[PDB]
Amino acid sequence: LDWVDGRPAAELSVRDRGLAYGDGLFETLAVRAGTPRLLERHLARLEEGCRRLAIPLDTAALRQELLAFCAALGDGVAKLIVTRGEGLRGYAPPAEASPRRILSGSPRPAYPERHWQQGVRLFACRTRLAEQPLLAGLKHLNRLEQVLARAEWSDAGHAEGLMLDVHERVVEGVFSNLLLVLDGTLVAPDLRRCGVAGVMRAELLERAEGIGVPLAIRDVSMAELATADEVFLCNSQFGIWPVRALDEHVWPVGELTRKLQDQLRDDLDF
Template sequence: MNLCRVNGQPVEVLSVQDRGLAYGDGLFETIRIAAGQPQLFERHLQRLGQGCSRLRIPCDLDALAGEVRQFAAELGTGVAKLIVTRGAGQRGYAPSATAAPTRILLGSAAPDYPASHARDGIQLFPCATRLAEQPLLAGLKHLNRLEQVLARAEWSDPAFAEGLMRDHGGRVVEGVFSNLFLVRGGRLLTAELSRCGVAGVMRAQIIESVAPALGLPVEVRDIDYQELLVTEEVFTCNSLYGIWPVRALAGHHWPVGPVTRKLQAVLAEPSSDP
């Protein structure tokens, strides 16, 4: 079932002057919908609100939340992509003080990922594309995803389910469409994202809710590539598929370990607060 709403209306047209199209001037959220409910929705709203504040895009989050919940109820099951742009504007980079934000909701079926990804683990492709450092945009899920487009174009072999992305200093940052965690010495490690990268909602859920429930300490810091190669377990995560164990990267191999399995089990438990 494919659904589309633009500013609350069931249309599929957008102004050619929209700044999201012209400059990537906006943000987006990819939200899993189950039984008519947006999952991890408060985390999605929190990240969107932080992004709108940093980009100075006015946004009524309460009204938008109601719009998304209504859309989710109509979609039932699948994925809702929420896009908020600064709106239409005249030529030039300077944003108009009177521009009204554009709200776009796109609904689609859930991606058909192989069950083996979660069960047996995945192989990462070592992407040559490096993430540029821009602290003003770091952590945000802004509309300019050209780095990810270039990285994803590096491989077509279905043996690779995801790619590893590093910054120009060679530090491990994330996957092309996921965040990355290491398991080492009884604790979780994940990259510090003040220079680049996307602060995923599943990453936040693991750091703030799932890991504490299991008594697992979490360390957020820079991760050297060599440290990745000698760690005990590796997994990726995002809001659509949860957790995928990583079993291989560039000739290096890891087991699907007990910590990763425990985290998967907690995420699989029914939640009363979607």
């Protein structure tokens, strides 16, 4: 399945701004029984990106179109890309821009359950996240940093990689967020300089507060990570992977990590 602007289409104009400048946003939605999981959260992040990038998307008409696409897809993944649309001259956002809405469907990808069960080893990526507060948190199309980090390893012994910012602060994975427990306190790295504010990160923070777990969003150092009670990665496709190792560091699978897995599995079928 591929749609452009709500009609079957597998191609778009070579003059699109999504292609020219990565001038756009994306969401990757798990689909079950014709409907997207965690729909509200995916929509909330897309809408906030459209606000901050001033892309005149009608997010209300989009929810309809997306719902119809997911019903046609039935089961798997729906990737939505919104671009600012056709480019006139150069960088200037055009005045009367019409955003392109591209929907592409795929099968559930093959995330191994053993990563959820036994946990994973992170690759210590050397590619750093640049600090850019105007784009921080948004799931925009400028993803060359993730492409470069992903390319640093190709083996099966590492399921994800650790991305630090240019001050070596601990930020996130290559395609997932990282959270850690420091004193029975659940700590999420602050994403106001770089990173992607994950839908699962937002979901788990709210669920942990629901159960009385003390939270903090703040800067986290490498030294703090090495001494953490437990560590895990999350995203809206695999849910939670406990982190067991990073270079010489090891961590056991933690109690809070297991409690949240059990909540995600029973409540939402992760």
